Amino acid sequence: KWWYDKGECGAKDSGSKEKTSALSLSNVAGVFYILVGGLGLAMLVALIE
Amino acid sequence: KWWYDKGECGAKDSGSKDKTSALSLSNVAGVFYILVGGLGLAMMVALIEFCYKSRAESKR
Amino acid sequence: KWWYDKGECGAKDSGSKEKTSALSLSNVAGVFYILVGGLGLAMLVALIEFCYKSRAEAKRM
Amino acid sequence: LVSRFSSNEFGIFNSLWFSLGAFMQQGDISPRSLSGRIVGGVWWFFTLIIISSYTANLAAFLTVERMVSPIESAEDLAKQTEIAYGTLEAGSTKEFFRRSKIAVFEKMWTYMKSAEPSVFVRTTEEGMIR
Amino acid sequence: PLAYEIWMCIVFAYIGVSVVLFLVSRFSPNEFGIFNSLWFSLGAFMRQISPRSLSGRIVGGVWWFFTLIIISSYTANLAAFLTVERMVSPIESAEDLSKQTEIAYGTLDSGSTKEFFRRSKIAV
Amino acid sequence: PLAYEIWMCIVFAYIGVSVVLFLVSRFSPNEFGIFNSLWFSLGAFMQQGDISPRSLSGRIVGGVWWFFTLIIISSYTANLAAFLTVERMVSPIESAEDLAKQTEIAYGTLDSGSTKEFFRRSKIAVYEKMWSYMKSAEPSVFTKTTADGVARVRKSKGKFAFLLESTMNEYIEQ
Amino acid sequence: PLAYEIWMCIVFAYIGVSVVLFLVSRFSPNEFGIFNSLWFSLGAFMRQISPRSLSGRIVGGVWWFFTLIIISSYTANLAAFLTVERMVSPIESAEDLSKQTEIAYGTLDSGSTKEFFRRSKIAVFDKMWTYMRSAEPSVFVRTTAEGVARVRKSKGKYAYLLESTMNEYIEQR
Amino acid sequence: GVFYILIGGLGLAMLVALIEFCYKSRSESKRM
Amino acid sequence: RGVQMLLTTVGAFAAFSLMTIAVGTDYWLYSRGVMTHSGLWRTCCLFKGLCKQIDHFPEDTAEYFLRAVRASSIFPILSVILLFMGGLCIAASEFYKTRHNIILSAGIFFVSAGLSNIIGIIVYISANAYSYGWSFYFGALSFIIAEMVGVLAVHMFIDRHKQLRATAR
Amino acid sequence: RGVQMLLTTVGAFAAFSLMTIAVGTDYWLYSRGVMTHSGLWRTCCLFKGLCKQIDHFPEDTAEYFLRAVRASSIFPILSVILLFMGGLCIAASEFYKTRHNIILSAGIFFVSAGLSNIIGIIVYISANAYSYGWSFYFGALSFIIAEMVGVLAVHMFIDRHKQLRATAR
Numbered sequence A: 001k002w003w004y005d006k007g008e009c010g011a012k013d014s015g016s017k018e019k020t021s022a023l024s025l026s027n028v029a030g031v032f033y034i035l036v037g038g039l040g041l042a043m044l045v046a047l048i049e
Numbered sequence B: 001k002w003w004y005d006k007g008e009c010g011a012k013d014s015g016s017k018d019k020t021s022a023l024s025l026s027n028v029a030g031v032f033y034i035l036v037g038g039l040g041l042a043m044m045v046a047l048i049e050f051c052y053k054s055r056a057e058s059k060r
Numbered sequence C: 001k002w003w004y005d006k007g008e009c010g011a012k013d014s015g016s017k018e019k020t021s022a023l024s025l026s027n028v029a030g031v032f033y034i035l036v037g038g039l040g041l042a043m044l045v046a047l048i049e050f051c052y053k054s055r056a057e058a059k060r061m
Numbered sequence D: 001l002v003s004r005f006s007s008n009e010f011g012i013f014n015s016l017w018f019s020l021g022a023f024m025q026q027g028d029i030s031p032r033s034l035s036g037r038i039v040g041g042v043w044w045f046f047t048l049i050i051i052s053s054y055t056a057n058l059a060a061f062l063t064v065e066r067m068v069s070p071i072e073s074a075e076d077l078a079k080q081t082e083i084a085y086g087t088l089e090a091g092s093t094k095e096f097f098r099r100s101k102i103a104v105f106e107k108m109w110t111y112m113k114s115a116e117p118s119v120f121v122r123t124t125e126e127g128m129i130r
Numbered sequence E: 001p002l003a004y005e006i007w008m009c010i011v012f013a014y015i016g017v018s019v020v021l022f023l024v025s026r027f028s029p030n031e032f033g034i035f036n037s038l039w040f041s042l043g044a045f046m047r048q049i050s051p052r053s054l055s056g057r058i059v060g061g062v063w064w065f066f067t068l069i070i071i072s073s074y075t076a077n078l079a080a081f082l083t084v085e086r087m088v089s090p091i092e093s094a095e096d097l098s099k100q101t102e103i104a105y106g107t108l109d110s111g112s113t114k115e116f117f118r119r120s121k122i123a124v
Numbered sequence F: 001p002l003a004y005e006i007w008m009c010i011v012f013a014y015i016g017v018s019v020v021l022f023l024v025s026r027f028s029p030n031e032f033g034i035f036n037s038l039w040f041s042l043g044a045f046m047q048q049g050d051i052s053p054r055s056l057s058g059r060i061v062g063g064v065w066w067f068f069t070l071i072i073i074s075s076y077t078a079n080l081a082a083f084l085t086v087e088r089m090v091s092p093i094e095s096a097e098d099l100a101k102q103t104e105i106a107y108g109t110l111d112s113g114s115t116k117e118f119f120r121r122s123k124i125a126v127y128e129k130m131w132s133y134m135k136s137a138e139p140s141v142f143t144k145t146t147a148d149g150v151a152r153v154r155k156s157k158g159k160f161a162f163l164l165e166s167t168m169n170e171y172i173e174q
Numbered sequence G: 001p002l003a004y005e006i007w008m009c010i011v012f013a014y015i016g017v018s019v020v021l022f023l024v025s026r027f028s029p030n031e032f033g034i035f036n037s038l039w040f041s042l043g044a045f046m047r048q049i050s051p052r053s054l055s056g057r058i059v060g061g062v063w064w065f066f067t068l069i070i071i072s073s074y075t076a077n078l079a080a081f082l083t084v085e086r087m088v089s090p091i092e093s094a095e096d097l098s099k100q101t102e103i104a105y106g107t108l109d110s111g112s113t114k115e116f117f118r119r120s121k122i123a124v125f126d127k128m129w130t131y132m133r134s135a136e137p138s139v140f141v142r143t144t145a146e147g148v149a150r151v152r153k154s155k156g157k158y159a160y161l162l163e164s165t166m167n168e169y170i171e172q173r
Numbered sequence H: 001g002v003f004y005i006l007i008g009g010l011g012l013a014m015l016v017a018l019i020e021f022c023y024k025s026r027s028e029s030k031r032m
Numbered sequence I, J: 001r002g003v004q005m006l007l008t009t010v011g012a013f014a015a016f017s018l019m020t021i022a023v024g025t026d027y028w029l030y031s032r033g034v035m036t037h038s039g040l041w042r043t044c045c046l047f048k049g050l051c052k053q054i055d056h057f058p059e060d061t062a063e064y065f066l067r068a069v070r071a072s073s074i075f076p077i078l079s080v081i082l083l084f085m086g087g088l089c090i091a092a093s094e095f096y097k098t099r100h101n102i103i104l105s106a107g108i109f110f111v112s113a114g115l116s117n118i119i120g121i122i123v124y125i126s127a128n129a130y131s132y133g134w135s136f137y138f139g140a141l142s143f144i145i146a147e148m149v150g151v152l153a154v155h156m157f158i159d160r161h162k163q164l165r166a167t168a169r
Ligand SMILES: O=c1[nH]c2cc(C(F)(F)F)c(N3CCOCC3)cc2n(CP(=O)(O)O)c1=O
Pocket: D090, D091, D092, D093, D124
């Protein structure tokens, strides 16, 4: 009564299921980084060749 | 008489609509729209560039 | 007590969901059918077009 | 059959290799006939939908793999019906569930008192074997 | 998944883009040919020659992105059907029994329940 | 399912890689033109395709740009699959135990009457938890009139519910 | 997804299949060339020329089915990550505090709780008292709500020890 | 497992290529 | 010359014999209420020893059509009849080769018979809804031998056509 | 010939002006605790009218390095310096073109400055986490015009190289 029922937390599977954050740039920016790095590597290699 | 016939709503169509049988056509209709737009744009570009090439080649 | 608690049917089909059960051939058999139909259609079309080509080669050449 | 019946697919390996390329996605040698192209169109959308179904079922089973965690509460025992459970046939453990006032434990004692067959064991090692 | 009639729209767009690509390819005065353009549109539809007229290439690229989005959405919805698999009941209300005739329905041979249907005033 | 802003950066990287191809292909041909470089960049951005270069530099630019967009469109496929998986998730509320199982959508009754006295004098622990939530809510979920509850539900966009008699609910439904 | 070390195994198999394809294609006395065979194996890896020796094409086909299975499994596992998203806690047991040192932990500055760690004889709790008695900076807080504010402003870097009932009561608010 | 079937197919195609090259080279050296 | 023709003939004969053995018995295996074998006509248990025709067709219209096809083995019996007709055509074309174009129609009928046998194998695998019999593997091996024999027959036909085209000039 | 050089010069000048405007103000916009504009140096609210430097990087180590790069806009300032160096090289190569290879190095530095500008735009878009300022679109348009100007510059360089190769034979 005084902990589970009186408390302000539902806490019985409170981890709801939708969470529709479509896609952040966090998974994309690290791939942009290796993209720009490969581009600069190919530029310098082509120039020195 | 007084709840169904007197009321201002239609038939309580099943359970909020019908049945999400499958995915709606609205995404498909939008990509249809951008496809038809790009189709007409590239068609008019092809027509004007053929007109330009014909005016260039026929008039030297 | 005497209907929901006394009964033998748990009214929760939300926990312990559908385990891994592999894809049936019923979704694959109709695809096999249109495969075999396309094969037979292509065979008959190739045979009649080769018959037309052979008739044209025998008549005009 | 059809390629040597009218080239590029004159050999058995060229025909088998174009069959492999039409079974997979990428590729090599493009035919020019009506018949070979329609054989490819029949055979190729076929395996397209099949490997799409392979991808979909593998993603479905990996979704199944990250489903509901094992039991951690008595509410998890009440929420299911597949995994049965029982106590010792004699002792204060059975008297705890028999004299319980909480409806969750009351449903537990109702299921264990009406179980078919009996979930109760005589000794601790009998429960170990069960 | 995802469609009962939209596949016919895909086939109609396939024939239309094929006609447009051939009309571009056969109006320049290698990639010409109505069956050649049709088979290249088919090769554009699923995965597996290239036009160089620099105007029908735009048509090919937009059709190619179009069918890529289609096969991606098809894979996604087929995974969605293979994931949940929550089938529903065909019959919901009492008017559903009057709406069809393939699935029959009956009562007990005697009783006041049958007398309710015998002495009813509702046309349903 | 991805964004409305990642696509612009992808198109900017697309035209940048095409600038790289027209730079290096004309600096070391089949990719001698700007349209040839842009068309090979478009072929490398999608899966299928056409004209394969022979240079070391063009091959390594393709290998950088191409596994890139492979992973990106695979992520697009997986993300749309995740969104459609969310689309077939949990059905709406159909029981009072569904109300007790959640806490995001609040609900209330009328401030006075035997309807509130039902939950106040209840003995079933689910309805006791319901009366515990209604009695300790912040702010008050109780309305003065029934039409106040109607305006509270209709201005909620699926965030608030109301409990009432079945005949009144069906009449307001009609 | 799907791998932390197996990507290097994929790269090693890529180099191996490239070496085998070059050894087949360039030992018959077009498709020869070490970078040509390497870039053709790269073309076999992802989606977007073909050998005619009818033996290295078998290598290309088995590599091509191999990487098709890989990218199918990659799409499947990435959908599995984007579907559920069930985050877990890094700290589970009491030995997890002694097993790491990045996430700090503290007790109250005065009370029998710190006396329990000061008077303990277990080497795990001895290491805990050694780590907390030489902590830089001071991990001890003034009040209970001070510890709550210290944990809530830590973003997963600092924890607090107390009685279980008060902990569960703060958990249920 | 897919690594194992890749290694098996790789070794099988390698030995088949080796024996067909050996047979073709022996036949070309003996005949021509 | 004659070696490839004799190999094609004995391959067609072995394919016809394995198709007859697949028609006969031991096609599938299914554990009844104990294991039991079936040969698409009757089931036999592993009391023990009794046999009866367990190919009962009853217990949309596409389910009735699939049950009608799975009943009485419409596909593989007509496939075996077409294989016997192709073998008779190959025997008539082996001796007194008057017309040099009947071998193409015989090979086309042979490939169509193989495709129909594969389609019937797909139907019998679909209608199965736990192990498998040996006659199913024998029918699969006969399908492999039939595919190889069709390849050998069309190879000999295109070689004979190229020889006739070289002799015509 | 010279019309393409004048178009490349005014395109480089417009790209440098739009890069300066993108560095200046109105780069991004976000609703604060009311709306507020930002130009990667200081934020200004919509009381109303006050402005302060709200580009505070504090409140794994890869997050620290990303915050260090996003602090004070290290990448686009160096990109704009490289753009100004490429524009000065193009201005030095326009009149008194003695060296026949300085335009290639100028174009290579200009394309690398554009790529660094796009990388810095990606970092600035990543570090923000609702609308966006007009200077972001202006910097994007300057990146597009800079790419087109690099294409035109290397096109003029390969035309000059082909003319020199034709005059050498
Ligand atoms: O006073 C009691 N003390 C008990 C102590 C123990 C333990 F210490 F754990 F050994 C146990 N067991 C737990 C179950 O497996 C068998 C032994 C039973 C006890 N019981 C019987 P109860 O009626 O079931 O409580 C008592 O009555």
